Amino acid sequence: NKTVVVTTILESPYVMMKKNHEMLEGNERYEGYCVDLAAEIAKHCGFKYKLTIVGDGKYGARDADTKIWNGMVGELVYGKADIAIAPLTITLVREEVIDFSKPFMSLGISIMIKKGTPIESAEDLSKQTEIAYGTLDSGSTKEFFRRSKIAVFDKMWTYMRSAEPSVFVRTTAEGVARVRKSKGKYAYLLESTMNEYIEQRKPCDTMKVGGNLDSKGYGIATPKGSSLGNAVNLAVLKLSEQGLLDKLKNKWWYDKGEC
C-alpha cells in the first residue's frame, strides 16, 4: 500500500487554488471538479493519494524529433506520476502510450468569440481573414487541426501554423484574455467544456458559437499496464451511473454561474 501520485493541471474549474491555500496543506490546497472527482475515485478504489500539479503546465504532446513526451502524459510515460485526473482528452496517439478509462466528461472542439463577432461556424472562420483564430499549444485541439484531412480544417491549420504574430497561446486563460481584449478580432478554438464554463463567468462577454467540430471526452489516464486501470474504470462507470458525474458538472459549471 503506497500513496498514489496524481498529476493534474491548474485549469478552471477542474483544479484551482483555494482562496487561503497558503494556510492549508497537501490536497486541501486545491478545489474544483477534478479535485472532487479524485477524492471519489480514490475512495472507491481504496487508495490514498497526493495531488501534484504537472511541472511544465502542459497537457501532453510528443516533440517531433526529440520524441519526448511533455505535460501530464509525459509524467505518466516517464514514471513521475501514477495517474492523471484532469481534463485530459482521449486521443489515439496518447492511447498508444498510456491507458485511458472510459470518458467521465464529454466535449468537442468549439469556437469562442467576443459577443457580437461576425462568426457562426468554422467554415466562417476559414472563409475570412479579418478575424484571427488560434488554439492552445501542446493540446489535443492543436493536434486535431495539424492532422485533419477535412477541407475546412486543413485550410484552417494552414492559416494558423503560418499566422504572425502567433495565434497560439500557452494557457486557456491566455486564449480567453486574448478574445476579450481583441475587440472581436480574435476567435479562440477550445473544448466546449472550457468554452461553456467561461460563458458563465463575468464579464459575460464571450459566447460559444456554432456546433462542435468533433465529439470526444476526457478520461482518467494511467501508465500502460498499470494495476490501477481496471479499478479506476469501474469506479468511473459506478460514479457515472449513480449520477455523480452529472452532479459535479452542474456544481462547477452552472450552480456557480455568474451570468
Ligand SMILES: NS(=O)(=O)c1cc2c(cc1Cl)N[C@H]([C@H]1C[C@H]3C=C[C@@H]1C3)NS2(=O)=O
Ligand atoms: N454530461 S457530462 O459531460 O458531465 C457526462 C459525460 C459522460 C458520462 C457521465 C456524465 Cl455526467 N458517462 C460516460 C461513461 C458511462 C459509460 C458509458 C459511456 C462511459 C462509460 N461517459 S461520457 O459520455 O463522456
Ligand SMILES: N[C@@H](CCC(=O)O)C(=O)O
Ligand atoms: N484537453 C486538451 C487540452 C485543451 C485543448 O487542447 O484545447 C488535451 O488533453 O490536450
Ligand SMILES: [Zn+2]
Ligand atoms: Zn462515492
